[PDB]
Design a protein around this ligand. Structure first.
Ligand SMILES: O=P(O)(O)O[C@H]1[C@@H](OP(=O)(O)O)[C@@H](OP(=O)(O)O)[C@@H](OP(=O)(O)O)[C@@H](OP(=O)(O)O)[C@H]1OP(=O)(O)O
Ligand SMILES: [Mg+2]
Ligand SMILES: [Zn+2]
Lengths: 167, 444, 175, 261, 55, 170, 52
RNA sequence: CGCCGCCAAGGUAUGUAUCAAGCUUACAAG
């Protein structure tokens, strides 16, 4: 309800942000409205951290609707924390976090080859999700001030205009 | 490949502003990108975001621009809708044959809804078949089966839906696509299907191949197998797509005439389904001899069961020893039952992916013996066709001739008849060579 | 897959045998409790036997539950009409939905209706309380014959000949 | 081949699948210039398929020849356009499967190809489209090809040059003689004959089709432009005009006598 | 469930959940050891395991 | 009439699709990764054996190939509406970039998908009764005595002043 | 592609004209050249007639 | 002793003249 209010404030109405946080044109935009409607990394990096939290919240709400159980939820959001990048496209707008994508994928191996020690099997079920959760929180630990500042400049330039030949 | 006038002597000596003088020629750069489109656009490297083009169904796994500009000129003039309409009208028009079923009253092409052809998340019924009363339909199975138990809801009307898709080298298996996506729409809740019965037909445009997965009212499956093998063989919209790929790709043949392809059984052998030929003529065979005494009699010496894979050249030669020619009765009349047991034992012995989808026997004496011995394998078609082959002339070549005659056991040997021809020529041409060599040895 | 059922799970089913065939309506008892209590209570009374489907707008709705047959006679088991019970995951996007029929305010009685298609004009105006189990949606598409004679009410409307209760949550007695 | 199938007439019906299969496969062939044999064979046997009750396979190879016209070889594309011309004749224009709404725009950049065979076949086809199918356009499009038919003069074959002036006449009868004529009057200052006498001829064609009094005020006007070529051009166009109209010169002789004096 | 404190704007604009987690570290490490054990015993003894269909 | 199965269990899955499986490619045991795994395994078991020629299959004479899809992930799909078409060569027949232009060079003005979507949502002289409506040469049906009085007025007709030439008929 | 270092061109260009229009513009250009040179020379005997 | 995994701009011009919602205060007032 606020990423959609930026779009309705800028009078776009040919882009559609849907409830799973994608953003899609619907009109083959002509080139005076191709140039007014593109967003930077302050819109898109916030849109994909919200897509990440929308997937985590949808996992817990799938559990508390009661149509998936606790072992299966634990494997669920272990897959979410281990396989972002494949399911959010957040690296695209801020590429330094690709390291942490790899750091999930690296430590996944640590856990996923000690579950499968002994007669346990090479399939899904590794619901030990603390070690990926931690690093995607340590991302947000230092991405709070940066894209808070990026959105500060975005909301300033939207609500008091850009300064042409100031600085 | 391309030959056409890249030298272009004095081209037609035009004026050439600036960017058409010194800029880079995009068109070989994008026909190369079109050419490897299954492996540059494969569906499962990162399996996250994919973007389907409008008016088509191609899905573009990546941000590759040159691939998109290559794959839009060959689906140029609304041609996905055009292939949809062409095949749906061809196989509503193949149901002018109405009374050869139980019956069909009408075949209603439903209202031409645009955007059906590439709406992938939802589907409609495409042509609906009404009936007088009570088609007793089957349970849903592919059209690559044979079993078709056919005991389910006796229903009035029977829809048919047709689906189109595109290649991409990791999902080119539409035996599976038709199954999965039939289930998806028939268990859906946005579906506007008029009956719980009918079939979904999937065809695979790049890598052109077809199947279906619905349930089958009695005289339908062997009808529509031929009825859409003819559509894949010949259809004008699905031919202008073919040649428009060829023209957006700069490929040309280099043969004088059409390479031996017709409505012959030669031609569907090589659709990467495993087909086997089976010769059983020489199971019983008798030597010609004079004894000590002047009398003339017959000796039942050991015979051969030839099983031949035309795509790989593999020749499964089963020996049938002399010593099972004693004790049994009706000796010229029990080989047809003692053959299908051994052939199904061969089916059971081989790996899962190497066993056939279709077996083509010689002159018909084993369709019901193979049907009753293949109870463990429902989905194998047993056919007799008009490519009768002189595998008896294989008993004239000496490496086979001594090995068939001098054996102490049901030995079950393997040979390879395409020696090293597949290094240089195709299965198609090596088969057209082998049947020449065997028929030439046979007649002389 | 990608198909996403997108509506809450049901509880409690009533088979209902009209002259067009057998229709097995399964209820959202938790998501709409008073209306589902009304419907299984009336079906358990055998209130709806010989009741006709007196209004067919083909492609839009087909109404029933009027034992007078004119379009106004409905007597709930609450005495007064009861409240509408909306839900954000129960909307009129498809066929097979079953909903109580209203005349404005919180006025829900016995008179209910099937949908026959998409009915987005009725969102937040009627109480969806059940869907129809598939392979029997075609028996209620038999109910939409173009026979209407008028803006409503065809020649020989289908009557409800029986009404079973295949599963009964929330204990009740008839009258 | 053409004479044989024209003799067999309707008895050639169980051989049209064999022939059309042989031709459609024959039209790939290493690019090895047996593709103008296939396209020429289509142009020769285009006659026998209408009189043998075959329009499905006509609708089948019309759309195929619609996209063999992106060739780089000129002599392949010329026989393609000859075949497509013969199909446009043997079918109606308004009932053909690569319809003229999206066939003529493919032909406007073909028209900038300076090979003589491709030019020749292209404007024969554009002439038949321009008189019999002028409702399949923008009427901007006819204007942006009647600037193409000035460069489609200076073509060393004289059949091109006498077909393009007919196409000016037909374009004019479509869109009116006040836009095509300002084009032909800017063309009169070029320094080149084969390019001014054959636009003078085109002025007489646009005169006599859509009656003079639509060309003759402006053509009378541009004698006042002080250049040698444009003055000899309007006099030569009055020559071809009176030669073409004949007995309608009873009405216009008093209008041009103060010019000729 | 884990109900948790929160801090929301009167306009309903934003809802900050206002708590630092704070676990006792032996009981936390032992709880994760507990479900390492229980979750190995569930992957060993499930007939076939399906994840979530992740959006 | 489709008779119901008459059981109280509801229509669909118990998890309501929360394990939807994406089964649009070749299944797990017949997949090419599994065939590769079979070949790897059987080449590991036969190691001390030296050409015992029992043949075992095609590959096994001595995870790449078509790769397996994640079953548990629906791919997020968009529409790539924006066509790559030279606006010039579409509506003019001439691109200034020649064949170096990065766009298509198409000239077909067929509708887009969204355009199809947003169309998809939407007597007589005396003015009396015909007292012998009777005719002249040229279709003119008049009343009888009224057209006789019309001839007394003017000898030609009323509709287009055509010469009756005395000719008057029923 | 070098989108920076490719030989540029602008959209809607209409292209470089053929030989007839180019050398007609050359003759008009050369006319303006000789007219301004005789204007600078202030020649009083240059006349251009009724036909160029 | 086992690198590697990719978004945006850069092209389909901009500049004028009439015609509503978006957003803006719900005010000073004989
Ligand atoms: O990432 P995915 O391809 O989806 O599969 C990963 C993982 O992949 P990476 O190791 O490339 O990160 C491994 O599978 P492979 O490497 O063999 O493809 C891993 O280790 P194991 O394969 O040894 O288990 C396991 O795969 P598996 O499915 O066998 O558990 C796991 O799978 P998840 O995707 O379920 O984490
Ligand atoms: Mg530039
Ligand atoms: Zn271009």
């Amino acid at each position: 309800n606020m990423l959609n209010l930026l779009i309705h404030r800028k009078n776009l109405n040919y882009l559609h942000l849907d409830y799973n946080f994608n953003l899609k044109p619907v009109k083959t935009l002509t080139t005076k409205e191709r140039k007014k409607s593109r967003f930077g990394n302050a819109f898109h990096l916030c849109r994909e951290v919200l897509r990440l939290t929308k997937l985590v919240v949808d996992s817990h709400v799938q559990y508390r609707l009661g149509n998936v159980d606790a072992f299966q939820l634990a494997d669920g959001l272990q897959y979410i924390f281990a396989h972002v990048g494949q399911l959010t496209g957040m690296y695209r707008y801020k590429y330094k976090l690709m390291r942490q994508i790899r750091m999930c994928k690296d430590l996944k191996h640590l856990i996923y080859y000690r579950f499968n020690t002994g007669p346990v099997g090479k399939g899904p079920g590794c619901g030990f999700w603390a070690a990926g959760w931690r690093v995607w929180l340590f991302f947000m630990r230092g991405i709070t001030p940066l894209l808070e500042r990026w959105l500060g400049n975005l909301l300033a330039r939207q609500f008091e205009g850009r300064h042409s030949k100031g600085v | 490949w391309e030959k056409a006038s890249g030298f272009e002597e004095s081209m037609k000596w035009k004026k050439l502003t600036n960017a058409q003088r010194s800029g880079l020629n995009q068109i070989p750069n994008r026909r190369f990108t079109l050419w490897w489109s299954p492996t540059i656009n494969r569906a499962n490297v990162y399996v996250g975001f994919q973007v389907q083009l409008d008016l088509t169904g191609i899905f573009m796994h990546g941000k590759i621009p040159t691939l998109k500009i290559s794959l839009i000129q060959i689906f140029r003039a609304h041609l996905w809708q055009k292939i949809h309409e062409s095949i749906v009208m061809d196989l509503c028009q193949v149901f002018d044959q109405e009374l050869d079923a139980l019956e069909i009253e009408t075949v209603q092409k439903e209202t031409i809804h645009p955007r059906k052809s590439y709406k992938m998340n939802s589907s409609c019924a495409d042509i609906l078949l009404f009936a007088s009363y009570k088609w007793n339909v089957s349970r849903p199975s592919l059209l690559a089966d044979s079993k078709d138990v056919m005991d389910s809801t006796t229903t009035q009307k029977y829809w048919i839906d047709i689906q189109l898709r595109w290649g991409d080298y990791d999902s080119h298996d539409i035996e599976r696509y038709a199954r999965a996506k039939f289930l998806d729409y028939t268990t859906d809740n946005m579906s506007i299907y008029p009956s719980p019965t009918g079939v979904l037909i999937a065809i695979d445009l790049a890598y052109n191949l077809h199947s279906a997965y619905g349930n089958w009212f009695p005289g339908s499956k062997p009808l529509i197998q031929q009825a859409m093998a003819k559509i894949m063989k010949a259809n004008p919209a699905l031919y202008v797509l073919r040649e428009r790929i060829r023209k957006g790709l700069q490929l040309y043949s280099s043969e004088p005439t059409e390479p031996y392809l017709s409505s012959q059984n030669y031609g569907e052998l090589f659709s990467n389904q495993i087909i086997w030929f089976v010769d059983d003529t020489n199971v019983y065979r008798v030597t010609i001899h004079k004894t000590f005494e002047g009398n003339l009699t017959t000796k039942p010496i050991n015979g051969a069961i030839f099983i031949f894979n035309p795509r790989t050249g593999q020749l499964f030669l089963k020996i049938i020893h002399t010593s099972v020619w004693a004790g049994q009765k009706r000796l010229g009349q029990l080989a047809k039952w003692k053959t299908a047991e051994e052939v199904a034992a061969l089916i059971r012995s081989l790996p899962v992916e190497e066993q056939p989808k279709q077996i083509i026997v010689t002159r018909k004496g084993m369709l019901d013996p193979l049907e009753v011995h293949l109870l463990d394998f429902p989905n194998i078609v047993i056919k007799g066709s008009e490519l009768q082959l002189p595998f008896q002339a294989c008993l004239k070549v000496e490496k086979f001739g001594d090995l068939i005659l001098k054996a102490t056991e049901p030995q079950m040997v393997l040979f390879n008849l395409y020696d090293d021809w597949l290094k240089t020529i195709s299965s198609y041409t090596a088969f057209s060579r082998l049947i020449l060599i065997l028929r030439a040895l046979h007649v002389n | 897959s990608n198909i996403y059922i997108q509506e809450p799970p049901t509880n409690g089913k009533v088979l209902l045998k009209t002259t067009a065939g057998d229709i097995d309506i399964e209820l959202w008892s938790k998501e709409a409790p008073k209306a589902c209590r009304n419907f299984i209570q009336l079906c358990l009374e055998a209130y709806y036997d010989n009741t006709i489907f007196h209004r067919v707008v083909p492609g839009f709705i087909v109404q029933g539950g009027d034992p007078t047959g004119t379009g106004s006679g409905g007597e709930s088991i609450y005495g007064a009409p009861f409240k509408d019970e909306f839900h954000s995951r129960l909307r009129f996007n498809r066929r097979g939905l079953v909903a109580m029929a209203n005349a404005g305010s919180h006025d829900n009685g016995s008179q209910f209706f099937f949908t026959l298609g998409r009915a987005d004009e009725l969102n937040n105006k009627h109480t969806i309380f059940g869907k129809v189990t598939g392979d029997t949606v075609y028996n209620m598409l038999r109910l939409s014959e173009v026979d209407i004679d008028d803006d409503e009410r065809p020649h020989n409307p289908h009557k409800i000949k029986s009404c079973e209760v295949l599963f009964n949550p929330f204990d009740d007695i008839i009258p | 081949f053409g004479t044989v199938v024209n003799a067999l007439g309707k008895r050639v019906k169980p051989y049209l699948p064999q022939i059309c299969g042989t031709v459609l496969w024959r039209l790939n062939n290493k690019s090895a210039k047996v593709r103008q044999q296939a396209a020429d064979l289509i142009s020769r046997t285009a006659v026998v398929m209408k009189t043998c009750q075959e329009e499905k396979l006509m609708g089948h190879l019309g759309v195929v020849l619609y996209e063999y016209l992106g060739e780089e070889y000129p002599e392949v594309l010329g026989s393609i356009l000859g075949a497509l011309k013969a199909i446009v004749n043997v079918i109606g224009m308004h009932k053909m499967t690569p319809p003229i709404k999206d066939l003529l725009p493919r032909l406007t950049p073909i028209l900038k190809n300076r090979h003589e065979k491709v030019q020749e076949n292209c404007i024969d086809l554009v002439g038949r489209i321009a008189d019999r199918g002028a409702e399949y356009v923008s009427a901007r499009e006819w204007m942006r090809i009647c600037f193409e038919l000035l460069e489609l003069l200076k073509a060393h074959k004289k059949a091109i040059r006498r077909a393009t002036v007919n196409t000016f006449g037909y374009i004019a009868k479509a869109i009116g003689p006040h836009d095509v004529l300002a084009t032909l009057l800017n063309n009169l200052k070029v320094q080149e004959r084969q390019n001014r006498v054959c636009t003078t001829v085109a002025i007489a064609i646009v005169a006599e089709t859509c009656s003079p009094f639509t060309v003759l005020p402006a053509l009378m006007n541009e004698y006042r432009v002080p250049e040698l070529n444009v003055q000899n051009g309007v006099l030569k166009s009055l020559s071809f005009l009176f030669e073409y109209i004949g007995e309608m010169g009873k009405d216009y002789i008093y209008a041009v006598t103060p010019l000729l004096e | 469930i884990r109900d948790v404190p929160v801090l929301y704007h009167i306009t309903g604009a934003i809802s900050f959940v206002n708590e630092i987690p704070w676990v006792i570290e032996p009981v936390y490490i032992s709880q994760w050891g507990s479900m390492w054990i229980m979750m190995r015993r569930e992957k060993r003894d499930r007939r076939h395991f399906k994840r979530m269909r992740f959006p | 009439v489709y008779k119901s199965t008459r059981s109280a269990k509801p229509v669909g899955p118990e998890d309501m699709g929360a394990t939807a499986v994406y089964e649009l490619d070749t299944e797990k045991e017949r997949d090419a990764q599994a065939i590769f795994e079979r070949s790897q395994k059987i080449q590991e078991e036969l190691r001390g054996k030296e050409d015992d020629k029992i043949y075992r299959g095609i590959n096994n004479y001595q995870r790449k190939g078509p790769i397996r899809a994640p079953e548990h992930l629906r791919a997020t799909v968009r529409w790539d509406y924006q066509p790559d078409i030279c606006k010039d060569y579409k509506e003019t027949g001439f691109c200034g970039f020649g064949d170096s232009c990065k766009f298509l060079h198409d000239r077909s003005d067929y509708k887009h998908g969204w355009q199809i979507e947003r169309e998809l949502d939407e007597c007589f002289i005396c003015r009396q009764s015909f007292q012998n409506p009777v005719v002249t040469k040229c279709r003119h049906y008049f009343c009888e005595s009224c057209a006789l009085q019309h001839f007394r007025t003017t000898p030609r007709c009323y509709v287009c002043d055509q010469q009756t030439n005395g000719v008057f008929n029923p | 592609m070098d989108f920076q270092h490719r030989p540029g061109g602008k959209t809607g260009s209409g292209g470089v004209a053929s030989s007839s229009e180019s050398n007609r513009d050359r003759r008009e250009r050369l006319r303006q050249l000789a007219l301004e040179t005789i204007d600078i020379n202030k020649d009083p005997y240059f006349m251009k007639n009724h036909l160029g």
